[PDB]
Amino acid sequence: CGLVASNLNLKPGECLRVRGEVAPDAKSFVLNLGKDSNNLCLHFNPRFNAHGDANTIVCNSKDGGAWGTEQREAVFPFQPGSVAEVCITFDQANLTVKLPDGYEFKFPNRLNLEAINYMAADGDFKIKCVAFD
Amino acid sequence: CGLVASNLNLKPGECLRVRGEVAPDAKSFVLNLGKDSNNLCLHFNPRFNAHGDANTIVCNSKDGGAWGTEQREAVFPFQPGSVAEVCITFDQANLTVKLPDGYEFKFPNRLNLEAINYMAADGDFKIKCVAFD
Ligand SMILES: CO[C@@H]1O[C@H](COS(=O)(=O)O)[C@@H](O[C@@H]2O[C@H](CO)[C@H](O)[C@H](O)[C@H]2O)[C@H](O)[C@H]1NC(C)=O
Numbered sequence: 001c002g003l004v005a006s007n008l009n010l011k012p013g014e015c016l017r018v019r020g021e022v023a024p025d026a027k028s029f030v031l032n033l034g035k036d037s038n039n040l041c042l043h044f045n046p047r048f049n050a051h052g053d054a055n056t057i058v059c060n061s062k063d064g065g066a067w068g069t070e071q072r073e074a075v076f077p078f079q080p081g082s083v084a085e086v087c088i089t090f091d092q093a094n095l096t097v098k099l100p101d102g103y104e105f106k107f108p109n110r111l112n113l114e115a116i117n118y119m120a121a122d123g124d125f126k127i128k129c130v131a132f133d
Numbered sequence: 134c135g136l137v138a139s140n141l142n143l144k145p146g147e148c149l150r151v152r153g154e155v156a157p158d159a160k161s162f163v164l165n166l167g168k169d170s171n172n173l174c175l176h177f178n179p180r181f182n183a184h185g186d187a188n189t190i191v192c193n194s195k196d197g198g199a200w201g202t203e204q205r206e207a208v209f210p211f212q213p214g215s216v217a218e219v220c221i222t223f224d225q226a227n228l229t230v231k232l233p234d235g236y237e238f239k240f241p242n243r244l245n246l247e248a249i250n251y252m253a254a255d256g257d258f259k260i261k262c263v264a265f266d
């Protein structure tokens with residue numbers, strides 16, 4: 001795998017800031033958030049060209065080991081061989097993923113945990129900085 | 134108990150930067166680096182008021198669950214109720230630790246792992262930023 005962080009104790013309203021390097025030969029990368037590897041309130045998966053998808057962001061949840069229903073976004077502000085920063089927060093309703101250039105995606109909060117304690121990176125994404133503000 | 138990061142894959146020469154907030158009533162905090170919770174090539178434990186110790190940095194290793202020979206540092210550039218950054222790197226011989234007011238002490242590499250894959254924080258230290266250079 002890639003970087004795995006636990007015991008984050010990120011509460012609602014708090015911001016998780018992630019900066020990483022997207023491989024020049026990136027097919028996709030993954031940002032997983034939740035309670036643990038089996039309970040993800042956000043599976044954040046920009047696909048450059050992978051699993052039959054091209055320039056498409058695929059989000060999903062994982063509940064008790066069971067993948068939820070995939071959600072897709074039209075816009076794709078990610079370029080291979082580049083640094084990508086992501087700010088994540090959540091409330092009772094949605095997880096919000098903000099990019100600095102103003103892009104903002106919502107994913108419905110399907111798990112309703114009191115905190116994000118788990119973060120995992122995977123695929124063609126190497127994390128350089130992680131911040132909690 | 135506090136933040137735990139694994140699969141860091143930190144190689145020699147690479148810099149691991151951690152910045153956090155030292156609680157105003159901090160008695161101590163812990164920074165653990167190694168393969169896992171049983172194999173630490175560096176146990177970084179600034180003690181403000183703890184285990185009978187004052188303004189003392191204690192370092193140690195843990196090999197196969199067994200604590201190594203403890204080492205302590207005299208300088209203590211840590212003030213409670215303040216933000217403290219610590220930069221850590223290593224080679225085959227020593228781990229090098231940079232302290233916030235510019236201090237730098239070496240701790241002998243006793244485990245000889247090819248990489249630091251594991252980091253655990255604990256005690257009166259809340260992490261605000263983690264970076265890999
Ligand atoms: C259903 O068709 C394709 O299924 C694969 C495999 O799904 S599964 O549930 O993992 O067995 C989908 O790829 C997977 O998607 C999940 C998120 O739901 C993870 O990203 C996982 O890493 C990935 O392999 C794929 O989306 C889907 N393809 C279509 C129809 O677009």
Ligand SMILES: CO[C@@H]1O[C@H](COS(=O)(=O)O)[C@@H](O[C@@H]2O[C@H](CO)[C@H](O)[C@H](O)[C@H]2O)[C@H](O)[C@H]1NC(C)=O
Pocket residue numbers: 176178184191192193200203
């Ligand atoms: C008399 O030596 C003291 O021993 C205690 C307990 O050591 S033990 O191996 O756990 O039995 C030391 O406290 C422990 O120190 C290690 C690192 O050496 C860890 O931080 C551990 O969390 C902590 O409980 C103590 O440092 C040591 N004190 C002196 C004065 O040597």
